[PDB]
Design a protein around this ligand. Structure first.
Ligand SMILES: [Zn+2]
Lengths: 122, 56, 207, 114, 124
RNA sequence: CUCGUUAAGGAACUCGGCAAAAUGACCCCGUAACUUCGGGAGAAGGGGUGCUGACUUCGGUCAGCCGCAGUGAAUAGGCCC
RNA sequence: GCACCUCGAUGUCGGCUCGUCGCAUCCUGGGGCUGUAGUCGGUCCCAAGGGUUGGGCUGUUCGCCCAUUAAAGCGGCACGCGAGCUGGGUUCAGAACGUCGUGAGACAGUUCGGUCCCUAUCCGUCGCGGGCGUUGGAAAUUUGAGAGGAGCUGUCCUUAGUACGAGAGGACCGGGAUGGACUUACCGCUGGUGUACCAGUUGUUCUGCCAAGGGCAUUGCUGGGUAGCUAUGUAGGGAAGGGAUAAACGCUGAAAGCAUCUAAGUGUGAAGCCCACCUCAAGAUGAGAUUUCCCAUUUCUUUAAGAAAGUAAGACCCCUGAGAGAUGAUCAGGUAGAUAGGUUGGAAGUGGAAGGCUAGUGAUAGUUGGAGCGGACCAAUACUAAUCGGUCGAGGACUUAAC
């Protein structure tokens, strides 16, 4: 669960490192976000050089939370991190490389361009 | 909070109608006859359930 | 229509044909017996009186044995009435067993919730706290009692008091499995009440 | 208890090998990618096991591409096909929660024959 | 399991004392809550005294009080028995062939300064 | 009212981080602007610490062993612009 | 504006907690007109069932901004609510600045600091018992006069790239899937807690010493965790319908040979109204109904709805308790016995006991052996305690009618 003023690492090649969450789009008083949910955020730390510069308001999708997800067959998955990928308003990564491993729920929510580039898809 | 009016004799006594004492189950001993509390030892003779208990 | 009385055993798990895990509640119901048939000419309405769970015989009295004698059973612990069931089709002595239901069969389930005692407005009604610091002296209290003008408190101002112990029914649950030689029904989800408490199961009102 | 065990008895698996928390294991899961059926493998150290009945579960830790991953399974699902013990570890407790704050060489578990 | 007006270590002290009495005396006057909790503790000591071995002895010695004597014994010496030695030489062999239930409670009377209901708890 | 613990988040609380939590011992390495040249300075930031054996020039160092954790309890600076 | 009211005292604003009411309607529902092609809109009418968000800046309302939403309504209630909270602000005693004053001092100018008491008598609100009544005494099952809860809404897919339109663009009416907020239960799963459960470890003191343990140091500290209680966990819900209506729209129809929804007749029509769903309910003194159980001594005031006595069916006192609980009540039992303790097996949980052996100079390791221990959980078993007893509790009125 990820709420207002949580901080996420970036699993992308876009020029951002840390991100601060501003909204949890979808609903009118919704509290938390999960794996496969879209978000509005601030860039807090960038990389010297990069398409995305610090201070920008931008959209991102969550992969890889600590309090993870639950599957219909009774099994669970959990990660050691919270991470997101910055998105281009029709679900495409604004970078070209995803880092680290990714949850399989991004298929059902139809981020198919992102499930092509992840190293591992769990 | 402070009582705004004193309470009269009738209302005091109507409050005090559930303020009594009771004297519940009293039986007669099987060994010596005198009255005693049920499920207790008899204090007059020290017998409970037809045997002697407060002796050696 | 369909409806039976039983007792609550507990909760477990089960896998389905496709291989999904599903939480379940076991209900045990030995055969129920029809003790009386109420009609419009005699009583003014139509119903059926059912008994469940045989009782030792030092524990009943003579009026109860007389009521249970016309049906040739032992005295029962739990006696309920079942309404809206085409009478016909039923007579004193009959046994209703769990094979009245089959897998599928969306159903209603009723019981009496667990008891919890004297509880405050926060646990009892979902009311929120006051602040825990910042000079505060208002943690766990029920709020202001109203405005000044009517010189009194309105009704349904909610407060502390005894919690739990009421009857509750839950609608549109599924029967996952029926076992006849053991007198057991498996219902998907959770039900109200404690263990060994009376449970009633009827076919659903909203269909 | 005994009414519940009797109902749930006919659904316990019999081909489950013995292992402890501390051992390494290969789970042969089953994935469904559209209509296709397929089998993955998930290799790691068993760190938990909390039990009694059909309700038994266990969990496996792995480090994939620089991030640590945990996956819990029920013991008797049909959606697993194989649990293989690869190594045996020397351990002193039941919950290895201290492994989730170590990395690389500090997270080493010694082997043992059995 | 009945808090008895005490914290966690004072309850344990009080029970350890009241069961070492009644091993030494075999008959005692106490209130009614303490007597129930104590029936449970004392019979747990007797089924270790019937077990007999060294492991059982050291298990009991965590609970029976030490520097207390229980002597009705003299051949020609000052030979003392130790109230754990009595548990293992006397009370276990006594209840050899009885299953549980080595005590019994009787009710007498309320204490004068208190109105506390009192009780006698004895062995056979 | 006085105490102990808490998933995920981590000042979003409130007039205001109020109150809590965090730092805390000894040994070693290191340490900026500015300055009345004394200071600033415990600046900041990092490492070691148990037990057995051998050697101990002396103060210590090497070899081995055990646990999640070695100032294994109690007592003891939060810091920066 | 006025000065009736309160000076032997009626405590100011924003915020918090808890709301309730009006409708001049912010969203959602239904409509007429349009300078209404479609998609979006303008305006007027009917409608109060439910809904109406988190931050930044200021003591601040107010206001501006950021990111969302179906929408981010306006008023009353001592500008609701301090014997319910806060005291940031205004309005005590200290000190300073600009400014006025010869001065003491002063300023709806500003600045830093600054004491908010109360054990609930009555009515009222939420829960829980005792008494009597309901016309013989009892054990159960119930009808429903009344009353309360609930009432929100988004996106996609299809119809269909169809109607409409030069193009750009793009529907009504239907069907299907899946969400947000809110809410009723529950502990099988994911976690929290778990001070009479298991283990590790520091200091010191005691069991005479060694080995093995107890006491104290926040439960000394650290790692786990059963029952029970729990959400952030899991299951469900606001489904479809009927009836009478509002605005609006008619059909037939004359007064008034025509026209006209209306006068006589006859329809359609809203998230609203009465039902439909859930819960409470015969103290509903209008006290309702059904099934079953029990059936007569003594003196007379005078024979009377008379008194008193022993009983039936049944109930209670008293004891073991928990699925119940502030107490009392409720439910499970009292030898016609598994009600609680103990005992004998088991389980969760911990993680390899004590005593020996073997290998090491030692710290330690391996082995006997998934060992030992094990609150609340599961089976069996009368071993201890539910002993012996007592108390209360019917004898059924009168009038008319039909049989
Ligand atoms: Zn006597």
């Amino acid at each position: 669960m990820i709420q207002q003023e949580s901080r996420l690492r970036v699993a992308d090649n876009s020029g951002a490192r840390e991100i601060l969450t501003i909204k949890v789009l979808g609903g009118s008083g919704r509290k938390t976000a999960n794996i496969g949910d879209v978000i509005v955020a601030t860039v807090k730390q960038a990389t010297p050089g990069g398409v995305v510069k610090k201070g920008e308001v931008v959209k991102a999708v969550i992969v890889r939370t600590k309090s993870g997800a639950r599957r219909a067959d009774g099994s669970y998955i959990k990660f050691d991190e919270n991470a997101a990928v910055i998105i281009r308003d029709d679900k495409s990564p604004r970078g070209t490389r995803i880092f680290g491993p990714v949850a399989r729920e991004l298929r059902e929510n139809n981020f198919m361009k992102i499930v092509s580039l992840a190293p591992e898809v769990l | 909070a402070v009582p705004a009016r004193r309470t009269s004799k009738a209302k005091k006594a109507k409050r005090r109608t559930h303020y009594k004492l009771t004297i519940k189950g009293l039986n007669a001993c099987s060994n010596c006859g005198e009255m005693k509390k049920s499920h207790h030892v008899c204090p007059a003779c020290g017998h409970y359930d037809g045997k002697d208990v407060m002796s050696k | 229509t369909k409806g039976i009385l039983g007792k609550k055993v507990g909760m477990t798990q089960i896998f389905t044909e496709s291989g999904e895990l599903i939480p379940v509640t076991v209900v045990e119901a030995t055969p129920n017996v029809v003790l009386q048939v109420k009609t419009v000419e005699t009583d003014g309405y139509e119903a059926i009186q059912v008994g469940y769970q045989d009782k030792r015989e030092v524990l009943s009295n003579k009026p109860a044995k007389g009521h249970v004698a016309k049906a040739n059973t032992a005295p029962k612990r739990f006696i309920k009435e079942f309404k809206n069931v085409e009478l016909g089709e039923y007579e004193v002595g009959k046994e209703i067993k769990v094979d009245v239901f089959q897998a599928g069969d969306v159903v209603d389930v009723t019981g009496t919730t667990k008891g919890k005692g004297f509880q405050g407005a926060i646990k009892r009604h979902g009311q929120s706290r006051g602040p825990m610091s910042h000079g505060s002296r208002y943690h766990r209290r029920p709020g202001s009692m109203g405005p000044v003008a009517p010189n009194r408190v309105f009704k349904n101002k909610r407060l502390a008091g005894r919690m739990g112990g009421d009857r509750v029914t839950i609608q549109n649950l599924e029967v996952v499995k029926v076992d006849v030689e053991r007198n057991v029904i498996l219902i998907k989800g959770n039900i109200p009440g404690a263990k060994k408490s009376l449970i009633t199961i009827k076919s659903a009102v909203k269909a | 208890n005994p009414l519940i065990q009797e109902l749930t008895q006919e659904q316990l698996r019999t081909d489950i090998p013995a292992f402890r928390p501390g051992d390494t294991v290969r789970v042969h899961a089953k994935v469904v990618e559209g209509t296709r059926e397929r089998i993955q493998l998930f290799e790691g150290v068993v760190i938990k096991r909390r039990g009694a009945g059909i309700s038994e579960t266990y969990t496996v830790r792995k480090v994939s591409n620089g991030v640590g991953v945990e996956r819990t399974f029920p013991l008797h699902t049909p959606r697993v096909a194989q649990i293989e013990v690869v190594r045996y570890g020397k351990v002193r407790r039941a919950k290895l929660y201290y492994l989730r704050a170590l990395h690389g060489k500090a997270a080493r578990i010694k082997e043992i024959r059995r | 399991y009945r808090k008895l007006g005490r914290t966690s270590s004072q309850r344990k002290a009080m029970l350890r004392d009241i069961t070492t009495d009644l091993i030494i005396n075999e008959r005692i006057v106490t209130t009614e809550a303490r007597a129930k909790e104590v029936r449970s503790t004392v019979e747990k000591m007797i089924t270790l005294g019937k077990r007999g071995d060294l492991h059982a002895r050291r298990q009991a010695a965590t609970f029976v009080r030490n520097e207390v004597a229980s002597v009705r014994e003299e051949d020609e010496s000052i030979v003392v028995e130790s109230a754990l030695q009595k548990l293992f030489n006397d009370l276990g062999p006594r209840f050899a062939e009885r299953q549980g239930g080595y005590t019994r409670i009787l009710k007498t009377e309320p204490r004068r300064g208190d109105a506390a209901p009192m009780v006698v708890i004895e062995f056979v």
